[PDB]
Design a protein around this ligand. Structure first.
Ligand code: A3T
Ligand code: A3T
Lengths: 143, 142
């Protein structure tokens, strides 16, 4: 898994078209979304993650949570970003892992948001630019 | 080298303060910048790249140019983004390679911009979200 964490003033997205044959079912009002003062977690689930979805998810939840705590981010946004890597995990498994990460962060007490899975999506973000506002994390199963 | 390419409506940046002991000298006007209808290339120069700066730079220029052509972009913006990777190359090497890429892209005839090297920087971007608007490349020398 490849994770790019961006502490932002906001994140705004706009669904433009389906990127998969069978994307995540959503309704019309979810075709646009936004979250303020948020740590955006751009995530690409990698093929190697299929080996152990649960372990990767738990570790992702831990790493993302640690950064949020550091920057005082109360809001976290899980953003499907497949092209952060080249070896992509299957969409069914990717979706599964992203759901687990979302569920895990919510359990940790954060106000978590997410963008629909399986779409071509436009987005606007404003990075605060502080010392820990831009961080990347590579998370893989215990090999 | 790690490269994140974002085809955007715009890229806007604001220098905060230095993140390295000796950053790229800058004038007041260089503290802020903006470019529109642009392919933004967030680049992280990695340790492995120190083995062959020219090679990595040449490949980066080629890859970036091919994408810009693919997405029909005439403007390209080189954005030093160290944290795209975990294994960073020396700053002196990172700066030289970033400068090589910037110039290589200009040589291709593109309208190219670049953000100052060595600073904590805030930025605003608007990704077009169309196909090919988000791509990444890992470039490693011989
Ligand atoms: C396209 C771009 O603008 C948009 N932002 C996008 O990335 N869309 C992705 C994710 O929503 C999801 N998806 C599929 N596979 C994966 C994966 N391995 N990891 C993460 N997401 C995936 O399916 C879409 C196409 O890959
Ligand atoms: C900090 C964040 O907001 C900002 N965006 C930033 O990344 N600043 C980086 C680059 O400008 C440059 N820099 C140092 N090493 C490298 C490297 N290996 N690759 C690219 N740039 C580097 O030095 C700064 C601190 O690492």
């Amino acid at each position: 898994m490849r994770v790019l964490l961006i502490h932002s003033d906001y994140i705004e997205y706009e669904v433009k078209d389906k990127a998969l044959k069978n994307p995540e079912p959503i309704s019309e009002d979810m075709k646009r979304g936004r979250m303020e003062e948020v740590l955006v977690a751009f995530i690409s689930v990698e093929k190697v993650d299929e080996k152990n979805p649960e372990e990767v998810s738990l570790k992702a939840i831990e790493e993302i949570s640690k950064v949020a705590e550091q920057v005082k981010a109360e809001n976290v946004f899980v953003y499907p970003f497949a092209h952060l890597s080249s070896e992509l995990a299957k969409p069914s498994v990717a979706m599964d892992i992203l759901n687990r990460v979302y569920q895990g962060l919510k359990e940790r007490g954060f106000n978590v948001g997410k963008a629909p899975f399986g779409y071509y999506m436009a987005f606007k973000i404003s990075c605060k630019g502080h010392p820990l506002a831009e961080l990347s994390r590579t998370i893989v199963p215990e090999e």
